Design a protein around this ligand. Structure first.
Ligand SMILES: NC(=O)c1ccc[n+]([C@@H]2O[C@H](COP(=O)([O-])OP(=O)(O)OC[C@H]3O[C@@H](n4cnc5c(N)ncnc54)[C@H](O)[C@@H]3O)[C@@H](O)[C@H]2O)c1
Ligand SMILES: NC(=O)c1ccc[n+]([C@@H]2O[C@H](COP(=O)([O-])OP(=O)(O)OC[C@H]3O[C@@H](n4cnc5c(N)ncnc54)[C@H](O)[C@@H]3O)[C@@H](O)[C@H]2O)c1
Ligand SMILES: CC(=O)C[C@H]1[C@@H](OP(=O)(O)OP(=O)(O)OC[C@H]2O[C@@H](n3ccc(=O)[nH]c3=O)[C@H](O)[C@@H]2O)O[C@H](CO)[C@H](O)[C@@H]1O
Ligand SMILES: CC(=O)C[C@H]1[C@@H](OP(=O)(O)OP(=O)(O)OC[C@H]2O[C@@H](n3ccc(=O)[nH]c3=O)[C@H](O)[C@@H]2O)O[C@H](CO)[C@H](O)[C@@H]1O
Ligand code: NA
Lengths: 336, 336
């Protein structure tokens, strides 16, 4: 049971607030939309359809009431444009900032646009939100911020050096939000995601995340690619934990704000294990080559989530396997 | 004597290089222009006359030969523009990146623009330089990166939380710089500036630094404003020391790159004391109120410069009193 989360969502269905989801056509963004619309919440959406998709918002309209869908006001626009950020904040209570160009590799190959989106775009929104005096400001941060710190599990106080531009930007994000707290009193919540997967994560692109990429590959009957040895271990996190975390961070009390929280499950799964999980969770619905390490890529990842458990009462209920089983059917429909 | 510097300055007079000075129309930039042009160097300059001044360039040309000046290719442009950044690098050997927006209060009032220039504009220079495969990359960093860390003097490995948007932007320059070494092999040198004063530091504007502000007001007879009790202390660093620092960094060995150095003298001077010095050095050329602290204000500042001494062979030869003596006549002249 996601106890506190449930309570917090009851509050929401009672006093609906106006939410801003930057990156709303994205994987996490669109999921927050689906949840938030079902919570009878008025959602202002912002997205420029870079990695995001019409077919995500389109999908969400499939899954919410007509009455609920009319509470959604989509805006096509750019967090890089400050004005846009100011337009969208009007009347907003809670800001769920999810818009960025993730991918460690992308950042290495184009750190310039990455910077514009992940830093400029982040600061623009952060500032627009402050000036609007929104009630909450929760932003997507990243577990790559840990960088080269050797310790496991990964605890918040304990970050090392960044290994990619992408890490820099997300670390920069975290830095600004502290400065905005210290100098403006604008208390925010950073969410250090660890490899979120689930419904609407893009299986296509050179920058596809492991889980969808490999799923797509098995469904086409193509080769499944393993970068390095395969023992590269990760804390995979089903979207519902992320959705949970955002909402809990939106309505966190003041004393738990100006804080970064690992969003994961505390589990550690290597790529050799995962490939097994996916194959097994896919063959239940009726249907491999090793290469060199990705550069900039962190070696091991396992989240310590006790902070979220303690301060926000986050209960990560869905582990990797349970989440994969919840995820496959969506990919089957999306790729048939 | 500034011995290694003497040696390196000669090395230039004989085999001059192409330098890029970003923020060449400004305090540190124009001084670097003057030193490099006097050394017969080829210099591409970049500046958008935001805080910089045409009068600064106008002054420099007065101080150098017409043939020395004809080796200055000034380009009016913004560093936020990636294209311009790439253009100016054509044929550059050494990059002296000083193009940024200082002033902690400026960033508190407008973090967006400070970000734009100091992070976006920096990354553009760094990225363009890396792609131009320039010989040296030296950027102006800041003692404000030390943030809340209580150490004194301030050594380079020991930093705390940034206390302002400005402090962030500068920290991020170092962080970007490191990542670039790690991921591209592009080794840079970051110069942590501690309160640089001297010829051509702007005495006007709301964001005038203390010395030109107080000197401007002691020649007008204006009230001298002290922010705080008066015991707030700085490591005041005359320009020549910075210039030494920038040239030493440019022709430093590979082993001494991907490194950050404090630029200062190593001395500690309080505002109560500074005020005494400025008065005494101005009355040697023939001519006070207390208020509350600056927010984002670091209380004490002093550099440990021993790293720079060991690795670059730096010699902080000009202390605060001697520096003021060389600065004053300029301010007398620039204002009369
Ligand atoms: N993939 C992960 O599990 C993970 C891990 C750590 C951090 N993050 C960060 O959290 C968010 C991840 O969300 P996702 O996995 O759904 O990513 P995603 O690829 O679905 O993209 C998120 C959305 O941001 C939008 N966007 C990008 N740039 C924009 C801009 N300039 N203006 C407006 N919208 C823009 C995209 O179009 C997309 O709709 C990103 O901010 C990412 O950097 C993700
Ligand atoms: N002197 C100090 O007290 C001090 C202390 C710490 C750091 N610094 C750093 O030294 C560098 C310059 O300092 P300064 O004292 O010469 O200040 P300055 O204002 O004299 O110089 C800044 C120069 O940057 C140029 N510039 C600003 N934005 C630009 C842009 N977008 N594109 C191109 N040019 C742009 C301005 O025209 C100006 O000439 C900056 O990195 C500053 O943060 C100075
Ligand atoms: C530990 C982190 O830094 C995790 C952050 C980081 O997520 P990540 O670990 O890069 O996710 P990925 O699914 O992309 O890679 C899976 C692994 O298998 C490798 N990989 C990938 C694809 C493939 O087909 N085969 C493969 O072996 C791949 O090189 C890697 O070794 O970037 C995310 C958003 O950009 C987010 O910040 C995460 O928190
Ligand atoms: C330790 C740092 O933070 C150093 C960075 C940081 O330098 P700084 O110390 O803010 O600059 P200043 O010379 O302006 O203030 C000196 C003292 O005079 C006091 N001050 C100032 C003006 C005045 O009228 N009266 C007064 O008392 C004021 O309260 C303050 O206590 O900002 C610089 C601007 O780019 C630069 O980046 C430095 O590296
Ligand atoms: Na708040």
């Amino acid at each position: 049971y996601m106890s506190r989360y449930e309570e917090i969502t009851q509050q929401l269905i009672f006093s609906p607030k106006t939410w801003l989801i930057t990156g709303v056509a994205g994987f996490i963004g669109s999921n927050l939309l689906e949840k938030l619309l079902k919570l009878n919440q008025v959602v202002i959406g912002l997205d420029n359809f870079s990695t995001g998709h019409q077919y995500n918002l389109d999908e969400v309209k499939t899954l919410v009431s007509t009455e609920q869908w009319s509470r959604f006001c989509f805006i096509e626009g750019d967090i890089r444009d400050l004005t846009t950020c100011e337009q969208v904040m009007k009347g907003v209570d809670h800001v769920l900032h999810q818009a960025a160009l993730g991918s460690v590799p992308r950042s290495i190959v184009d750190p310039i646009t990455t910077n514009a989106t992940n830093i400029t775009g982040f600061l623009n929104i952060l500032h627009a939100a402050k000036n609007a005096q929104v009630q909450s400001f929760t932003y997507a941060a990243s577990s790559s911020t840990y960088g080269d710190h050797p310790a496991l599990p990964k605890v918040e106080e304990n970050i090392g050096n960044p290994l990619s531009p992408y890490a820099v930007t997300k670390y920069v994000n975290e830095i600004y939000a502290q400065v905005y707290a210290r100098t403006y009193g604008f208390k925010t919540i950073g969410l250090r995601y660890f490899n979120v997967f689930g419904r609407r994560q893009d299986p296509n692109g050179a920058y596809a995340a492991v889980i969808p990429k490999w799923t797509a590959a098995m469904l086409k009957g193509d080769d499944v690619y393993i970068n390095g040895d395969g023992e590269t271990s990760r804390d995979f996190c089903y979207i519902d934990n992320v959705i949970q975390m955002n909402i809990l961070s939106a309505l966190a009390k003041d004393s738990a704000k100006d804080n970064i929280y690992n969003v994961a499950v505390g589990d550690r799964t290597t790529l050799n294990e995962l490939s097994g999980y996916i194959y097994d969770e896919l063959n239940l619905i009726h249907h491999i080559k090793y290469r060199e390490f990705r550069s900039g890529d962190v070696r091991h990842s396992q989240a310590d989530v006790t902070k979220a458990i303690d301060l926000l009462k986050y209960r990560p209920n869905i582990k990797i396997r349970e989440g994969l089983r919840l995820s496959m059917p969506w990919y089957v429909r999306f790729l048939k």
